[PDB]
Amino acid sequence: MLPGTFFEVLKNTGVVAIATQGEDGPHLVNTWNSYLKVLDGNRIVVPVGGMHKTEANVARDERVLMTLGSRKVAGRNGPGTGFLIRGSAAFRTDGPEFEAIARFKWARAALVITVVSAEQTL
Amino acid sequence: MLPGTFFEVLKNTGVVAIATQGEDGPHLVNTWNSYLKVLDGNRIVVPVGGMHKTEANVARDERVLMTLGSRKVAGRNGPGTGFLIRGSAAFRTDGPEFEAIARFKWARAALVITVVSAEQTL
Numbered sequence: 001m002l003p004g005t006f007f008e009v010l011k012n013t014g015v016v017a018i019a020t021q022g023e024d025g026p027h028l029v030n031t032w033n034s035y036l037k038v039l040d041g042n043r044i045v046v047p048v049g050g051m052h053k054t055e056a057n058v059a060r061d062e063r064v065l066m067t068l069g070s071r072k073v074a075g076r077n078g079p080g081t082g083f084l085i086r087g088s089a090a091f092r093t094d095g096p097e098f099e100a101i102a103r104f105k106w107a108r109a110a111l112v113i114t115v116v117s118a119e120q121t122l
Numbered sequence: 123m124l125p126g127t128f129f130e131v132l133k134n135t136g137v138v139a140i141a142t143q144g145e146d147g148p149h150l151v152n153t154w155n156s157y158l159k160v161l162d163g164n165r166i167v168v169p170v171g172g173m174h175k176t177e178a179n180v181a182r183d184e185r186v187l188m189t190l191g192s193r194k195v196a197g198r199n200g201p202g203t204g205f206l207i208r209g210s211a212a213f214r215t216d217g218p219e220f221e222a223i224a225r226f227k228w229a230r231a232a233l234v235i236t237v238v239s240a241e242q243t244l
């Protein structure tokens with residue numbers, strides 16, 4: 001599900017954005033490119049310190065969107081690219097998906113996104 | 123209302139994320155930090171090439187969220203910061219707000235976000 005160009009983006013620095021659906025509109029939070037941990041089976045794991053509103057949204061609607069990119073990875077028509085990822089999210093406080101990001105001692109949980117599609121948008 | 127630290131983030135490269143309310147959940151698109159033009163009266167202007175789905179969403183619900191950041195600008199508790207911006211959006215196709223981004227020869231419109239709040243989230 002995740003292409004090589006996505007893994008090239010993860011070798012570079014940047015701001016990741018994660019959109020969820022809430023009762024009165026979308027919500028949008030961040031992490032860093034370097035914090036994402038990709039697992040077998042199309043999973044992207046994010047260390048969670050805050051994400052309280054995000055977690056409440058995900059408990060009611062698991063579908064999330066994530067974007068990320070880098071000036072330093074070539075896109076289709078010149079330098080710079082990024083991705084729109086769609087997937088289903090879950091929060092974990094134990095098990096191997098939590099252990100994947102437990103090195104971040106500030107992490108109360110892991111946000112685990114099981115990818116359904118990845119689109120290179122540039 | 124946009125603070126100095128936000129303009130510091132704009133001196134740096136990065137991926138900007140813009141969330142809108144879609145018919146069946148959020149939508150999320152991107153631009154680059156360096157593409158944003160800030161005008162007086164709390165306005166952030168983005169060059170629009172695609173964004174047809176985003177534009178349809180804004181016509182139904184003008185409220186948008188935007189995030190952006192940089193590893194190179196100090197946050198409250200170490201290196202790296204970013205912002206959550208909430209505002210209302212409109213799409214201009216002539217006049218000073220369009221001229222503000224017309225340097226992008228591929229632009230079909232200017233996305234004008236009038237900022238209601240800016241929160242440094244790191």
Ligand SMILES: Cc1cc2nc3c(=O)[nH]c(=O)nc-3n(C[C@H](O)[C@H](O)[C@H](O)COP(=O)(O)O)c2cc1C
Nearest residue numbers: 029030031047048049050051052053054191204243
């Ligand atoms: C560049 C950047 C990176 C961030 N990294 C994280 C992160 O890895 N994990 C986290 O929980 N919050 C991180 N934050 C803060 C979140 O974006 C968010 O503001 C916070 O978790 C509160 O989430 P909520 O609004 O869903 O309650 C980061 C913020 C920025 C601007």
Ligand SMILES: Cc1cc2nc3c(=O)[nH]c(=O)nc-3n(C[C@H](O)[C@H](O)[C@H](O)COP(=O)(O)O)c2cc1C
Nearest residue numbers: 069082121122151152153170171172173174175176
């Ligand atoms: C890093 C990055 C920068 C982008 N810059 C722009 C931009 O400045 N303007 C634009 O219209 N689309 C830009 N795109 C593409 C949009 O994110 C989006 O995929 C496209 O405009 C289609 O919008 P829509 O899904 O609302 O129809 C960029 C994509 C990436 C990954």
Ligand SMILES: [Cl-]
Nearest residue numbers: 013014033034
């Ligand atoms: Cl990073």
Ligand SMILES: [Cl-]
Nearest residue numbers: 135136155156
């Ligand atoms: Cl940039």
